[PDB]
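Quick one: CbpB from Acetivibrio thermocellus, structure tokens please.
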Amino acid sequence: SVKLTMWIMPNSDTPDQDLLKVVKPFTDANPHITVEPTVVDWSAALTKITAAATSGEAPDITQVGSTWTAAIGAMEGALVELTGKIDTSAFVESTLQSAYIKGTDKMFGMPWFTETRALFYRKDACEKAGVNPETDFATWDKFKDALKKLNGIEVDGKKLAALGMPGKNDWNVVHNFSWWIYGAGGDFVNEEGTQATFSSENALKGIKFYSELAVEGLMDEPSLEKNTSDIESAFGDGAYATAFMGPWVISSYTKNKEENGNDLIDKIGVTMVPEGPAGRYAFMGGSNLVIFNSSKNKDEALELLKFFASKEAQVEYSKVSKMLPVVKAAYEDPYFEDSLMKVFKEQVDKYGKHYASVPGWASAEVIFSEGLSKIWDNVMEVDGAYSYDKTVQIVKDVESQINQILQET
Ligand SMILES: OC[C@H]1O[C@@H](O[C@@H]2[C@@H](O)[C@H](O)O[C@H](CO)[C@H]2O)[C@H](O)[C@@H](O)[C@@H]1O
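--- reply ---
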């Protein structure tokens, strides 16, 4: 007998159950293998995985944020090198770069699922505001015009803010800036992933355009006090006409209707992020699976990773979590005719961009999460009036620390 244990990060209200619903076909076909999941929340996962990699007090397998894979894989003796042990031909090509350490041929993770952030909107709010959501969000400038018409629009006598986005420190702080920087024609690092470049003229143009949506009263300023989960909940309670969110919120809003009669789910659509002067760009994230080098059943652990990559497990995991599969064949399933999920798939395939898969990137995100949240503190005027000039200084200070981190490699 073999007791396979794995850590998972939560994106639903029942993560352990969702997972067991997906691996049940595997366990029914391998009676000598048991699988026990354990939840590790996102804010603790990097610290916990890093500690477990060196102490050996670890499960056999852990989910890992795609942007962290290289950081963990670069830890000597931390993970099983998967190079050649998994068949990557079946995978969506673009998902594989985050499974390797950039500049090496070393694959330390297997892509598990993909996610991007799309523009959710209230159909009823748009109709009343005279906003056509199929056309009026297409570009930065049209998006901004639409927000002005949606600002303070009322549905059933309650005012909505035009755009609700979090500003508090969680991992999504940098993710929510990413595609504004990209769409302006900037990037976080050079091609090699070895120096920071997000104080460039173009990067700052994107930072200024996005952050000043709140200065101008279009993005809701009080919501910048809150984190992603709180703003997701607020949108589900009707607080905002629009919000940029991942696909998993659809599970939450569907449950809110089933349990509470909250019909928000029936009032929303989703469209791609607005196009900037560089063309359209979107955040590409998701998670990979890795096998700890300390695993005493690497044969079974590797067997379980291959099952998670099977067409049926990918379809079923996508159904329960709303995440996108990383296996091309899953998308032939009728389920992906869904009007909302189609948007996330088209956006990530055509316009998705993932960070450089470098070992220092995980540590960089810690600095991004604290550093860039100071931009929202500036906008929120908690220490003096807002000024763009203070944002520029915040960004330059973050860049210096990122460069020192990248130089450790
Ligand atoms: O930056 C770490 C990893 O973040 C992942 O995004 C998570 C979101 O899906 C979730 O909704 O919120 C948490 C924070 O509470 C985010 O960490 C990305 O999918 C990964 O690509 C990324 O490595």
